[PDB]
Design a protein around this nucleic acid. Structure first.
Ligand SMILES: [Mg+2]
Ligand SMILES: [Mg+2]
Ligand SMILES: [Mg+2]
Ligand SMILES: [Mg+2]
Ligand SMILES: [Mg+2]
Ligand SMILES: [Mg+2]
Ligand SMILES: [Mg+2]
Ligand SMILES: [Mg+2]
Ligand SMILES: [Mg+2]
Ligand SMILES: [Mg+2]
Ligand SMILES: [Mg+2]
Ligand SMILES: [Mg+2]
Ligand SMILES: [Mg+2]
Ligand SMILES: [Mg+2]
Ligand SMILES: [Mg+2]
Ligand SMILES: [Mg+2]
Ligand SMILES: [Mg+2]
Ligand SMILES: [Mg+2]
Ligand SMILES: [Mg+2]
Ligand SMILES: [Mg+2]
Ligand SMILES: [Mg+2]
Ligand SMILES: [Mg+2]
Ligand SMILES: [Mg+2]
Ligand SMILES: [Mg+2]
Ligand SMILES: [Mg+2]
Ligand SMILES: [Mg+2]
Ligand SMILES: [Mg+2]
Ligand SMILES: [Mg+2]
Ligand SMILES: [Mg+2]
Ligand SMILES: [Mg+2]
Ligand SMILES: [Mg+2]
Ligand SMILES: [Mg+2]
Ligand SMILES: [Mg+2]
Ligand SMILES: [Mg+2]
Ligand SMILES: [Mg+2]
Ligand SMILES: [Mg+2]
Ligand SMILES: [Mg+2]
Ligand SMILES: [Mg+2]
Ligand SMILES: [Mg+2]
Ligand SMILES: [Mg+2]
Ligand SMILES: [Mg+2]
Ligand SMILES: [Mg+2]
Ligand SMILES: [Mg+2]
Ligand SMILES: [Mg+2]
Ligand SMILES: [Mg+2]
Ligand SMILES: [Mg+2]
Ligand SMILES: [Mg+2]
Ligand SMILES: [Mg+2]
Ligand SMILES: [Mg+2]
Ligand SMILES: [Mg+2]
Ligand SMILES: [Mg+2]
Ligand SMILES: [Mg+2]
Ligand SMILES: [Mg+2]
Ligand SMILES: [Mg+2]
Ligand SMILES: [Mg+2]
Ligand SMILES: [Mg+2]
Ligand SMILES: [Mg+2]
Ligand SMILES: [Mg+2]
Ligand SMILES: [Mg+2]
Ligand SMILES: [Mg+2]
Ligand SMILES: [Mg+2]
Ligand SMILES: [Mg+2]
Ligand SMILES: [Mg+2]
Ligand SMILES: [Mg+2]
Ligand SMILES: [Mg+2]
Ligand SMILES: [Mg+2]
Ligand SMILES: [Mg+2]
Ligand SMILES: [Mg+2]
Ligand SMILES: [Mg+2]
Ligand SMILES: [Mg+2]
Ligand SMILES: [Mg+2]
Ligand SMILES: [Mg+2]
Ligand SMILES: [Mg+2]
Ligand SMILES: [Mg+2]
Ligand SMILES: [Mg+2]
Ligand SMILES: [Mg+2]
Lengths: 150, 143, 129
RNA sequence: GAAGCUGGUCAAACUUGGUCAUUUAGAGGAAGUAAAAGUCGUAACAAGGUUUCCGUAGGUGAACCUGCGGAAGGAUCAU
RNA sequence: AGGAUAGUGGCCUACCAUGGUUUCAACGGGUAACGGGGAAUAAGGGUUCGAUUCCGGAGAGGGAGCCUGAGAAACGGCUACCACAUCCAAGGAAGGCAGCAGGCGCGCAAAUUACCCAAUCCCGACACGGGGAGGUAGUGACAAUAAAUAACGAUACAGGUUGUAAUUGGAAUGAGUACAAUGUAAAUACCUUAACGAGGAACAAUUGGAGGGCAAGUCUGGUGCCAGCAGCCGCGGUAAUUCCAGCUCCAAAAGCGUAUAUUAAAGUUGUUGCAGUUAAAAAGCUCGUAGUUGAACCUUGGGCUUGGCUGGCCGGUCCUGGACCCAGCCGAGCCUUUCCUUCUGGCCAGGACUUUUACUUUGAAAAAAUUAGAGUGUUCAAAGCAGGCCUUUGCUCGAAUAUAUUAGCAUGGAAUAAUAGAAUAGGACGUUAUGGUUCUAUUUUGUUGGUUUCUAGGACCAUCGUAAUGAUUAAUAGGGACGGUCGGGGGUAUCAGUAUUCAGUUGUCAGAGGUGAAAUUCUUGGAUUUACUGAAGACUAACUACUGCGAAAGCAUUUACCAAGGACGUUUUCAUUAAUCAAGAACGAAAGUUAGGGGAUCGAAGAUGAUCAGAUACCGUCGUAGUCUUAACCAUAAACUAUGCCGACUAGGGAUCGGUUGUUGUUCUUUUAUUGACGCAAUCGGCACCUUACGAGAAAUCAAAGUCUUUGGGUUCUGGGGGGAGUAUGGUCGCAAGGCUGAAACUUAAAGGAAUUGACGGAAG
RNA sequence: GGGUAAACGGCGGGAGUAACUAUGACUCUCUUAAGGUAGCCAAAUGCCUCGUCAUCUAAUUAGUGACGCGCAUGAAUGGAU
């Protein structure tokens, strides 16, 4: 494990065996959808919407209630971001590291980490182009990266 | 996984790797470089004729102590000069200067044999007559 | 990473059988693993085995009866013509009277003896004896 | 309708030049190996009498010595 | 577009575009390279060879150009040049053996300047001529087949009814020679066969060996570390089992030895099938493209009928044949919500559609010779493709069959491995759904031809109706988010600490320093020592550990800031995005290089005092680069765990660090909780450790160095006896030092690993 | 009395020695402030000298490449490129 490290941690979520809503759940398949859309318009990414749903509304999984995954619902309502969320957070991190590097030129560790982050961007961006999520001519530019994650 | 590819479509990697690694085999390397053609005094032949330049005694290596009686021969085919041992008790008297001798290896395939230092060939015939025939008085040297 | 779930399954069975255990847990399951086990079970090399559904690839618990000397995969799955089966059984099997080379043919997964009966050949998949 | 003539075309061959490739000479220089154990010492193997070795850099008849940083393949698996 | 060609084609020309090939190796170079059928060796897989009896190509000393002709860029045709070379009366003329034979040369290396068209076939106007094509003989130990060199008696003895060891006989025969006949075109030879042809049956078997490997002498003479032998280990210095000989014996024998190459042996090239901790060999460490390899999941089960073949039961027996019966093994065909294209004539023949592969079955193809193999008394055999029959004015088995194997072709199967589809529906069905836009036409009303609506077929366009309308899990793969953390992880500033040295003040007074002992050195001009004060650079003691962090190199005073990170927790999110990686990149201790700044301390070089035979060494005192820092270079270390990375499994135990989750006769907040510490349990991740050896290993040892002859989870790199040598040369990087890449000649029988006994040690007890 | 050579400057002689000879790695001996280091050379610096060897020519006191006990080469009186 750990594409860009030697770690071997196994921590992750363990979905329950049951694929049905809990008996105590009373919200309808609709009320969750307007709840999802309401948070998506506030600027939350699909990861944060799911966190708010289980933390404060009892929505264990949006799929077991609504029938569709959170990003699938946003794409059906025209709220899907242009850049996929995980690629967006990688580019934002690379922008932050690159901005720190120009003021700390002797930080050779940050130079090493930037290569890891940018290599991780290119591998993920390459995947998104083959599944036609990004345009075939989409390319990550270090100079113009700040515009995408503005 | 034994350090070599096993995939069904990895024949190129396996074929190239073997080709690269056979160069570590000196028998294979000498055959393709043509070292016998370029470097060997005989030029790859089993035998070679030459002219006796001088009769020379060569001291054997330790722990042996003897005078190995060889000759200096200049090969006709390429003009190279080699040292050839003259085998058996008293066969040096059958070999004279400016005689034509047929040479052959010691059987170690380019290496020196026994305690004889730097000698890789032996005399087979002199003046067109077998050295063994002369030694056993089967024939006489034509002179 | 995990490149062959059949190799992992058979390796786990071999390690459990060598230590005298009468049961082994296999993860993950697959169709190829189950059909490979069915061939072993039909010839008596294993007992009853159990599939556990976890809404994922699955798990298997196999009962071992101590008759299994060795089971293994052949990686890669070489293409095997009918005339090539003899060479494989000579290299892989301990004798000409017992042991089986498992093939995947378009007629299904089967041992080399059944493949000769219905005159089919495919890719080699493993062995058992 | 012959010799011959004009212009083309294919173009051998030669001369010069370049380049490639293969052999080969050479004052002198610097090595390696074999032979014998010739001269000088004793660097290594024991804590080999300054533990040894690695990288690097100087020095020195020669092995080698010294500095800096490593290793134990240490002469300590330990207070 | 043309020209040219027999014709296609940048084949050539004109004009116009800027294309074409390539790490899946283009292009260039080498080949002691014609390709293939095939050959050698071979358990299998392979390795090596193929100039050479057949097929294809190319050439006729080297090029080039042509004539004739259906066909040639022909060479036993021509023209020219180059190189060789012949005759000449000096004016000229004539050449092409890589055809047959022959000569020279070259070399280790290869035959007669013979007979014939009789056979096999070819050519011609052809029943007739010609053929160094071809056949026949000569030379021929290239290879291959069969196969003599003696057999049998009697005595005499030895011997356990008969095997020999000797001296005594009569038989047998072909090697050879030959009448003759056969053979043949004519001969030779073979095959037959009169007469001749064997006792030492001299009609005389050789080649290598006799220490081991390796079968067979401790016999005799000679030499004396000489001569010589000896593939290797070794033998030989006065009783040599090894040399030179005699005897005897061994092995193979018309053959045996030697040299070189090659194959097996070699699992020492390893796909099957090697090795990489220490024997050779894991890149210093990460990233990364090609390449290789990649979790799981989609028609399963059930029922009925039926065909065939195996065993028998039946038995049905002259080993053999049938339903019934049992099981077993293959094929089917229907039904289960049901894939299996669709229409016309009506399973065969005539139309319309079709996700792409890989794989495997069957078929056809892969020339003959060769290989394997069936038949067949060439006297046997190697071979050959003949042959066999009661003896024939003819009858008659044959000349099989397999294998080829990549590519292509046809075909069945749908596991395994890929590939495509309906997500902004631009989706599917409506066979006769409703209209609309078009396009083509057989057929007329037959007296022939015009006229555009019905018509049929597309092909589209809209509407409507059908439908269960359409999105696989979320992998103890990965990525991302989030929540409390946790680190001596990094950078930039900043703040300590004593110490060292140097200086200033002070105090006394004779030494101080340094060593095994001294000396160099500093000292009444006050050294060393003492207190206070100050300045410089380094460095971060103790705490500090079988503890932490980092990709590695490395990282240890405080605080602030900057951007990272692992693990843990998660009923968050995405869904294969991944693993390892030629090429290509980032970082990379120390030393070293360039330029500034700093230069306390140590300290290469250097200088010096000792020691010593000598020490320009160890030891002592000084000391320059350097040590520190900023900008750049360098890219190497025993860069080590001498142990690649990813994944799974196999055994017990106690500690420990980080996170999380449950709980105390414990201390403390604060008086208690929601304090913190500690204690007890679980768990995930780490750094390690202890025991055992199921297991591994040559062992040392190893929880991986195991799951490896019971050999296959994925993948990268490296090694092939020791030296020469990480050398030479070329390239490339570097300012240089040097780095990376990297041979060969030659030389050598060991070098080496781990362990055992001993001996020794200026090691311990 | 101490420091200072990118201050002026300076930077040694004599014998013996290796299973032929030659040389002298080595040793002895006198002696300095230190005894010429890295380099370079019959050089624009070498007398002997037209040094010796090689190359260039038919022939070279010239040229170039080597050699080096160098009358009297040599390191910011800068050395070698
Ligand atoms: Mg894991
Ligand atoms: Mg993460
Ligand atoms: Mg990776
Ligand atoms: Mg190598
Ligand atoms: Mg060339
Ligand atoms: Mg010593
Ligand atoms: Mg000493
Ligand atoms: Mg020492
Ligand atoms: Mg020193
Ligand atoms: Mg045209
Ligand atoms: Mg054209
Ligand atoms: Mg043109
Ligand atoms: Mg060939
Ligand atoms: Mg050729
Ligand atoms: Mg050929
Ligand atoms: Mg040839
Ligand atoms: Mg031919
Ligand atoms: Mg010729
Ligand atoms: Mg010609
Ligand atoms: Mg011609
Ligand atoms: Mg001719
Ligand atoms: Mg001809
Ligand atoms: Mg002739
Ligand atoms: Mg013969
Ligand atoms: Mg005879
Ligand atoms: Mg004999
Ligand atoms: Mg002999
Ligand atoms: Mg003898
Ligand atoms: Mg024997
Ligand atoms: Mg021999
Ligand atoms: Mg020995
Ligand atoms: Mg004697
Ligand atoms: Mg004797
Ligand atoms: Mg071999
Ligand atoms: Mg090996
Ligand atoms: Mg070693
Ligand atoms: Mg090693
Ligand atoms: Mg490593
Ligand atoms: Mg799969
Ligand atoms: Mg019909
Ligand atoms: Mg054939
Ligand atoms: Mg085929
Ligand atoms: Mg998951
Ligand atoms: Mg976080
Ligand atoms: Mg805590
Ligand atoms: Mg700590
Ligand atoms: Mg770590
Ligand atoms: Mg690389
Ligand atoms: Mg560095
Ligand atoms: Mg400086
Ligand atoms: Mg200093
Ligand atoms: Mg001294
Ligand atoms: Mg010194
Ligand atoms: Mg000091
Ligand atoms: Mg510096
Ligand atoms: Mg290295
Ligand atoms: Mg280490
Ligand atoms: Mg290493
Ligand atoms: Mg690696
Ligand atoms: Mg592992
Ligand atoms: Mg804990
Ligand atoms: Mg064992
Ligand atoms: Mg252990
Ligand atoms: Mg370990
Ligand atoms: Mg080697
Ligand atoms: Mg020896
Ligand atoms: Mg040892
Ligand atoms: Mg000098
Ligand atoms: Mg001079
Ligand atoms: Mg001059
Ligand atoms: Mg002149
Ligand atoms: Mg001159
Ligand atoms: Mg000169
Ligand atoms: Mg001077
Ligand atoms: Mg100076
Ligand atoms: Mg001067």
């Amino acid at each position: 494990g750990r594409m860009h490290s030697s770690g071997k941690g196994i921590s992750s979520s363990a979905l329950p065996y049951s694929r049905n809503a809990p008996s105590w759940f009373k919200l309808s398949s609709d009320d969750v959808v307007e709840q999802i859309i309401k948070y998506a318009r506030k600027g939350l990414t699909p990861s944060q919407i799911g966190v708010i749903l289980r933390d404060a509304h009892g929505v264990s999984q949006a799929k077991v209630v609504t029938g569709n995954k959170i990003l699938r619902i946003l794409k059906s309502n025209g709220l899907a971001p242009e850049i996929p969320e995980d690629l967006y957070y990688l580019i934002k991190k690379a922008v932050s590291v690159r901005k720190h590097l120009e003021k700390n030129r002797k930080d050779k560790d940050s130079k090493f980490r930037l290569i890891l982050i940018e290599s991780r961007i290119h591998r993920l961006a390459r995947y998104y182009r083959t599944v036609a999520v990004l345009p075939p001519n989409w390319k990550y530019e270090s100079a113009t990266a700040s515009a995408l994650v503005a | 996984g034994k350090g070599k590819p096993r995939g069904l479509n990895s024949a190129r990697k396996l074929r190239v790797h073997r080709r690269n690694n056979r160069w570590a085999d000196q028998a294979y390397k000498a055959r393709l470089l043509g070292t016998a053609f370029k470097s060997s005094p005989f030029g790859g032949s089993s035998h070679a004729k030459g002219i006796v330049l001088e009769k020379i005694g060569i001291e054997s290596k330790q722990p042996n102590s003897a005078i190995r009686k060889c000759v200096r021969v200049q090969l006709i085919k390429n003009g190279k000069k080699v040292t050839a041992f003259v085998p058996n008790d008293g066969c040096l008297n059958f070999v004279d200067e400016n005689d034509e001798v047929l040479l052959a290896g010691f059987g170690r395939r380019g290496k020196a044999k026994g305690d004889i230092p730097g000698v890789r060939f032996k005399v087979v015939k002199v003046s067109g007559v077998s050295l063994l025939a002369l030694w056993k008085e089967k024939k006489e040297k034509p002179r | 990473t995990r490149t062959s779930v059949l190799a992992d399954a058979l390796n786990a069975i071999n390690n459990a059988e060598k230590t005298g255990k009468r049961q082994v847990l296999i993860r993950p399951s697959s169709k190829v693993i189950i059909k490979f086990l069915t061939v072993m079970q039909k010839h008596g090399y294993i007992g009853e085995f159990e599939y556990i559904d976890d809404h994922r690839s699955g798990k298997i618990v196999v009962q071992l009866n101590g008759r299994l000397n060795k089971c293994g995969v052949i990686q890669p799955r070489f293409n095997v013509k009918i005339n090539d089966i003899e060479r494989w059984t000579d290299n892989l099997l301990p004798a000409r009277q017992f042991g089986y080379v498992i093939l995947t043919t378009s007629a299904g997964i089967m041992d080399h003896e059944e493949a000769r009966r219905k005159h089919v050949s495919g890719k080699i998949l493993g062995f058992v004896y």
